[PDB]
């Protein structure tokens, strides 16, 4: 009926021990939660408990092996757990990330509790950490534990979903839900993301188009990635209409899970691109359009708080029901942004029909 919306203040018991000024901060997650309370929008969501993850949500995802190291951060110094963040690339750990991990994967759960039971039309948690980068045994990029993939396996298990989509429009490719799928039919991952060719983080070249998932799962894993800076609107705009809801609505998903980063914004400190924080209102309003509008989205990246902000209330007002806003950007996209969308195109166009043209 509603739009439900989860956040508790345990999302913030975790920061960089050895660097107070951190991008991934206790701030990201505040900052969203006021200006969602001064413009209107959080009075007018269904506010969701969160939960802990339990040991069985996380193994389907992830290593007992991996599950044990983790919960023993808890009980590790300064220097221990700099011991054990040096062992992966480019996170930090605190005696409060698992604690939190935990709420951060159950905070999404519980939204797609409620949204596969018809209790909400959809909803939002504003959770930390991250999620997207995480992988079956370890860590990575500011992530413990892979949310959306968890509440992927999740759906499928508990609620009897066949199918489900994963749409990434955090700036970086989260290539741990990739990894998690990438022999898998019944999850579709979709990333648009920086690359450079692979100059930008995480590196990788299956980060590319070329990487269309393996076995069963060829054509169900869907890279983006963006080759020069500065893409804007009409970018993400273009590659949505043309690319990602084609495929969508071919796949018929029963749930749609969103991996809700925000630093493709206007004024990330870090993304490189010219997104509006209007634009995600409209990716958010084509994506309701699919599985009856059953859409969790998550937070993922994005550093610049006030544009992470914006980013979030702008996807909010959509999945309210609000009219879409007044575009501030051209509505035609680039030509660095067609050559990558025709690239992809002709990547997936031998299992999509839709993508035939
Ligand atoms: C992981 C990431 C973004 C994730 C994200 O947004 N995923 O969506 C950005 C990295 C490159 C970064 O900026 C960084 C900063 C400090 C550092 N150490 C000093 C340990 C290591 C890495
Ligand atoms: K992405
Ligand atoms: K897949
Ligand atoms: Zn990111």
Same mark, same amino acid.
């Given at each position: 009926t509603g739009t439900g919306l989860v956040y508790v203040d345990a999302f913030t018991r975790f920061?960089?021990?050895?660097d107070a000024s951190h991008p991934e901060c206790p701030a990201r997650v505040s900052t969203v939660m006021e200006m969602l309370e001064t413009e209107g929008l959080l009075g007018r969501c269904v506010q969701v408990?969160? %939960?802990?993850?339990?040991? *069985?949500?996380?193994?389907?995802?992830?290593?007992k092996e991996y599950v044990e190291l983790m919960k023993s951060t808890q009980?590790?110094?300064?220097?221990?757990?700099?011991?054990?963040?040096?062992? $992966? *690339?480019?996170? $930090?750990?605190? +005696?409060?990330?698992?604690?939190?991990a935990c709420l951060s994967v159950g905070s999404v759960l519980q939204l797609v509790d409620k949204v596969m039971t018809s209790?909400? %039309?959809?909803?939002?948690?504003?959770?930390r950490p991250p999620g997207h980068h995480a992988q079956a045994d370890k860590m990575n990029g500011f992530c413990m534990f892979n949310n959306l993939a968890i509440a992927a396996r999740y759906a499928q298990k508990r609620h009897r979903v066949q199918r489900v989509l994963i749409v990434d429009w955090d700036v970086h490719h989260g290539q741990g839900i990739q990894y998690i799928f990438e022999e898998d039919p019944s999850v579709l991952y979709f990333s648009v993301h920086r690359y450079e060719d692979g100059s930008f983080w995480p590196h990788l070249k299956e980060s590319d188009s070329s990487s269309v998932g393996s076995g069963a799962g060829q054509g169900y894993n869907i890279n983006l990635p963006w080759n020069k800076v500065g893409m804007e609107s009409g970018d993400y705009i273009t590659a949505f209409q043309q690319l990602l809801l084609p495929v969508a609505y071919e796949f018929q998903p029963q749930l749609v899970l969103?991996?809700? @980063?925000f630093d493709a914004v206007i004024? *990330? +400190?870090? @993304? @490189?691109?010219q997104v509006s924080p209007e634009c995600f209102s409209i990716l958010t309003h084509m994506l309701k359009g699919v599985a009856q509008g059953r859409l969790v989205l998550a937070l993922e990246g994005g550093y610049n708080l006030q544009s992470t902000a914006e980013g979030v209330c702008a996807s909010m007002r959509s999945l309210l029901g609000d009219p879409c806003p007044h575009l501030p950007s051209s509505g035609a996209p680039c030509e660095s942004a067609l050559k990558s969308i025709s690239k992809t195109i002709s990547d997936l166009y031998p299992f999509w029909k839709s993508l035939q043209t």
């Open positions: 920061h960089c021990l050895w408990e969160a %939960r802990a993850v339990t040991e *069985d949500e996380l193994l389907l995802v992830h290593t009980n590790m110094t300064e220097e221990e757990l700099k011991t054990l963040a040096e062992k $992966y *690339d480019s996170v $930090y750990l605190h +005696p409060g990330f698992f604690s939190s209790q909400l %039309r959809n909803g939002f948690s504003i959770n969103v991996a809700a @980063g004024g *990330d +400190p870090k @993304g @490189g691109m």
